[PDB]
Amino acid sequence: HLSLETQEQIRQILSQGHKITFEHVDARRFRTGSWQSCGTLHIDAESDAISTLEACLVDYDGEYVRMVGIDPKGKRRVVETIIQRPN
Ligand code: NI
């Protein structure tokens, strides 16, 4: 049940011609910033982003999940936004 805001953030990234990678981390590895990707890297379509995020939320329920907007030129990380925290 993605919020309006989460979806707007997805659109904001894609509208820049940037690509989305979702990442997850458990509380222990959150301590050291040791995130890992979930799903396909460098998503370029909202449908794919929503599908992937919903999958990541289920698959890593209990972890942090965040969205990373990436400039395709040089794979520069532009923005990171936490979507879910541990429960
Ligand atoms: Ni839901």
Query: Resolution of the deposited coordinates, in angstroms?
Result: 1.4
How close is the Cα of 1 to the center of ligand 1, in Å? 3
* Structure determination method: X-ray
Overall domain count for the chain: 1
CB environment 43-79: b (16+ within 10 A), e (fewer): beeeeebeebbeebbeebeebbbbbbbbeeeeeeeee
How close is the Cα of 76 to the center of ligand 1, in Å? 30
How close is the Cα of 75 to the center of ligand 1, in Å? 30
Strands (E), 26-75: 36-43, 64-71
How close is the Cα of 54 to the center of ligand 1, in Å? 7
Residue 5: domain span: 1-87
Cβ-contact 52, 38 below 8 angstroms:
yes
CA distances (Å), origin 56, targets 32, 45, 63, 74, 81? 21, 16, 10, 25, 14
